[PDB]
Design a protein around this ligand. Structure first.
Ligand SMILES: *[C@@H]1O[C@H](CO)[C@@H](O[C@@H]2O[C@H](CO)[C@@H](O)[C@H](O)[C@H]2NC(C)=O)[C@H](O)[C@H]1NC(C)=O
Ligand SMILES: *[C@@H]1O[C@H](CO)[C@@H](O)[C@H](O)[C@H]1NC(C)=O
Lengths: 107, 72, 132, 495, 49
């Protein structure tokens, strides 16, 4: 039921850029959000749990912020191994819903 | 079924009218009056029983109105 | 190490039922929940349901009302998902992650947060194709 | 304002104790408060929202049957078995019919028989519960003193829309300038959740208490279904025909949606489409008001030449409103409003706008006030006495006191000991009345409840007769107390 | 009027969710933890007797 809109749907940027993603929820999900990368046809990897925390083993160029319903994911320096489909995901209330996705293209 | 136990004196009221808005009360009264009107013989039998047992007048009236209301 | 292994890809008939395994390694198998997530190729991710290894309660989403069954084997530390009434929309890649565990049972949300949904321990992926 | 013509409105006098006033407010009515300063605020309650429910139960309302297996063994050897009795998804029943050599078996007895049917379900009751958190009350608090666009229109941004939750506190709200108002809600003494069940049918929902909802027929199913359909009931639904001797058969009992609605009469309804939009129910604020100017004293008595642009407009026992249009060079000033008597001046009314004020220029400011029960001259001009208006509040003093007594009886009715908290600054008497009525209504709690309109008025008249029979002056605490509370409760309930 | 059964509760090094148990009386109660801007009150109603 709880919807999750992910914006924008696709981006292109050059190597070293700073890119931000925005996810909006129809309900209050106060901290329950997760950010994932997915390399296409590969085994994917968690980036951010609790919408603010790095996983150990993830490099420090990734970050996330936001509290109420609007959440911002941020890559400080875009690197050529970071071309992936990026997802944001609610954890609250359990008809567990993903974002639509965000594809990246290297310039 | 859920034809009965019609959630009546449970509490939980408010300022506003609840579901049937004073139509269920008149529903109850009109259907028991209609059932009395269709079956007069049981009413006469209840009146005879009220006159026989009890025999103080208030007790008679009480058990007569009860035996009119004992119908399911 | 911290690892899960799934079964190989399968192709089944419409209206049949398919069974996908999810074997665990590297930890105590009753210290995490197991959760199943699908992904159609022309779509993002979609959650299917939840099993607990300790004990064995399950639940699922409303889109899979009465179509999905989840069992396990504690001795082999393995979780089985069985999807029934297969149609062409079920052709997807299947995933089985783990959750941080409200000790006893189910898909709790108040104990902090599950913590991934589902890409830390998850496995290698099970492609299921419904065709004639 | 936002509170005119919404009658059953809760006037509140007194602020003493420093600033705290106890207000009990609900979705239906709204509350207007007053003090010797600190201008009159209006407390309208709007939607309640319980954010995170949890699903506890599924009742099936319509069902269908299929695959219809049946079996019978023999006359008194064997009681019949069937392999599709193994699933609890099938409904099964044993019976005894008859058997003989016409049927083929032998021994000519009354042999047993089974019947079985697969149970598939149509649209359901999706009953949910909520904890006494994850729920917010939204209160619009709005001030008086001018600003045309409509002494009604609760839609619109003049009163602030402050939220409150039991995870929150003293409820600081800000207004234009003066209105720093602190509200300390006690939402846990409200509807008393963990005794509530929200009940969703196809489009609607209802608020019914928990024991009734558990006790109800129309098959059980717990919240963890998904791939279940494990309905542990069905003696209340699907019925099995058995004619005189031979073969028995299965019968769907049909949709009980109408019977469901007839069951949940006497229960409040609720729209529940977007998460939740919970309605009618009350809550209890304590109100602190220090932090309040009068929107400027800081002015002058104005020049003159006002102009009415609206009628006399009496609302609901005295509250009369007048919309004046200042004409002149005001540089916004006060409005010299008075409610006077006739000549040899005996000025006696009250103004509930306190310190009304003109805005920047021509803008039709409006003023509400309460005259006495008879003739009155409402005057607004000063130097050429500019404008008087005659008004006759029909009224009474005794009728006003009796209607206030009826309001107090309705507060001894529907809203409970919170209505003993509905006043303020009572100290000894109000607190001891609340505790006494607490234990008294607890003894008349469950404790003689659960009864309908008719049976309550009948038990009232029989207990008032047995009090009228007058033994040893127990007839008071009998007859007069019990007859008053039973009749004035019975004719007012089932609203 | 209550009692605290944690006696002298204490914060650890930094952000770490410390937890406190206590016993209110049988009715209304305001459990308070902040000080200088009165930081946080909570209402609670132990039903009891
Ligand atoms: C209730 O309040 C609304 C919001 O102020 C009023 O709508 C305004 O009406 C005035 C009248 O000229 C317009 O100038 C505003 O632009 C309106 N505001 C809007 C559309 O947001 C509404 O008229 C009020 N109700 C009544 C009955 O007057
Ligand atoms: C019930 O009957 C239908 C057709 O008559 C059949 O397709 C279905 O499999 C049957 N159900 C079971 C449980 O065998």
């Amino acid at each position: 039921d709880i919807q999750l809109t992910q914006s924008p749907s696709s981006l292109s940027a050059s190597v070293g850029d700073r890119v931000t993603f925005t996810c909006q929820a129809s309900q209050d999900i106060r901290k329950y959000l997760n950010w994932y990368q997915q390399k296409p046809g590969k085994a994917p990897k968690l980036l951010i749990y609790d919408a603010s925390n790095l996983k150990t083993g993830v490099p420090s160029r990734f970050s996330g912020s936001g509290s109420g319903t609007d959440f911002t994911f941020t890559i400080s320096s875009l690197q050529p191994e970071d071309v992936a489909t990026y997802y944001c995901q609610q954890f609250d209330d359990l008809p567990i819903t993903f974002g639509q996705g965000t594809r990246l293209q290297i310039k | 079924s859920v034809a009965l136990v019609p959630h009546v004196g449970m509490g939980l009221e408010t300022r506003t009218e609840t579901w049937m808005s004073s139509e269920g009360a008149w529903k109850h009264a009109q259907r028991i009056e209609t059932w009395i009107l269709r079956h007069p013989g049981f009413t006469i039998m209840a009146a005879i029983l009220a006159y026989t047992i009890g025999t103080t007048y208030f007790q008679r009236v009480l058990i007569f109105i009860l035996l009119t209301a004992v119908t399911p | 190490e911290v690892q899960l292994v799934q079964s190989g890809p399968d192709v089944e008939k419409p209206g049949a039922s398919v069974k996908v395994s999810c074997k665990a390694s590297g930890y105590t198998f009753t210290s995490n929940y197991i959760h199943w997530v699908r992904q159609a190729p022309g779509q993002g991710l979609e959650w299917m349901g939840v099993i607990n290894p300790r004990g064995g309660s399950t639940a699922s989403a409303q889109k899979f009302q009465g179509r999905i069954t989840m069992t396990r084997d504690t001795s082999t530390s393995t979780v089985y998902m069985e999807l029934s009434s297969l149609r062409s929309d079920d052709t997807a890649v299947y995933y089985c992650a783990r959750g941080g565990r409200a000790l006893f049972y189910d898909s709790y949300t108040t104990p902090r947060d599950g913590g991934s949904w589902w890409f830390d321990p998850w496995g290698q992926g099970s492609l299921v194709t419904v065709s004639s | 304002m936002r509170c005119i013509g919404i009658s059953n409105r809760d006037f509140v006098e007194g602020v003493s104790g420093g600033s705290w006033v106890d207000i009990v407010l609900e979705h239906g009515s709204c509350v207007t408060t007053m003090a010797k300063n600190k201008p009159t605020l209006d407390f309208e309650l709007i939607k309640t929202e319980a954010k995170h429910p949890a699903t506890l139960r599924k009742y099936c309302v319509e069902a269908k049957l299929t695959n219809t297996t049946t079996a019978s063994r023999c006359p008194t050897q064997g009681e019949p078995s069937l392999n599709e009795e193994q699933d609890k998804r099938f409904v099964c029943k044993h019976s005894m019919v008859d058997r003989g050599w016409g049927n083929g078996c032998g021994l000519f007895g009354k042999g047993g028989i089974v019947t079985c049917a697969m149970f598939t379900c149509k649209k359901n009751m999706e009953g949910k519960v909520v904890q006494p958190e994850n729920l917010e009350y939204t209160i619009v608090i709005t001030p008086h003193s001018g600003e045309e666009n409509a002494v009604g229109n609760d839609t619109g941004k003049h009163g602030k829309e402050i939220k409150v939750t039991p995870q929150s506190s003293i409820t600081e709200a800000e207004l234009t300038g003066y209105g720093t108002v602190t509200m300390e809600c006690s939402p846990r003494t409200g509807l008393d959740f963990n005794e509530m069940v929200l009940l969703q049918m196809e489009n609607k929902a209802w608020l019914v208490h928990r024991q009734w909802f558990l006790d109800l027929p129309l098959p059980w199913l717990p919240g963890a279904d998904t791939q279940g359909s494990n309905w542990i009931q069905k003696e209340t639904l699907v019925t099995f025909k058995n004619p005189h001797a031979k073969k028995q058969d299965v019968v769907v009992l049909g949709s009980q949606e109408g019977a469901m609605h007839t069951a949940l009469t006497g229960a409040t309804e609720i729209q529940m489409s977007s998460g939740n939009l919970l309605f009618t129910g009350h809550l209890k604020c304590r109100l602190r008001m220090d932090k309040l100017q009068l929107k400027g004293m800081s002015y002058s008595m104005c020049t003159g030449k006002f102009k009415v642009v609206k009628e006399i407009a009496e609302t609901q026992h005295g509250t009369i409103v007048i919309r004046v249009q200042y004409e002149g060079d005001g540089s916004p000033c006060k409005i010299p409003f008075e409610i006077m008597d006739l000549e040899k001046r005996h000025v006696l009314g009250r103004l509930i706008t306190v310190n009304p004020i003109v805005t920047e220029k021509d803008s039709p400011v409006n003023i509400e006030a309460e005259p006495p029960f008879g003739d009155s001259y409402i005057i607004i001009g000063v130097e050429p006495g500019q404008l008087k208006l005659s008004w006759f509040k029909k009224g009474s003093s005794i009728g006003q006191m009796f209607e206030t007594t009826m309001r107090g009886a309705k507060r001894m009715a529907i809203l409970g000991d919170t209505a003993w908290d509905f006043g303020s600054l009572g100290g000894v008497f109000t607190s001891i009345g609340k505790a006494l009525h607490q234990v008294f209504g607890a003894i008349y709690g469950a404790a003689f409840s659960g009864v309908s309109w008719t049976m309550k008025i009948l038990i009232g008249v029989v207990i008032t007769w047995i009090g009228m029979n007058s033994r040893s002056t127990s007839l008071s605490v009998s007859l007069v107390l019990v007859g008053v509370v039973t009749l004035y409760l019975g004719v007012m309930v089932q609203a």
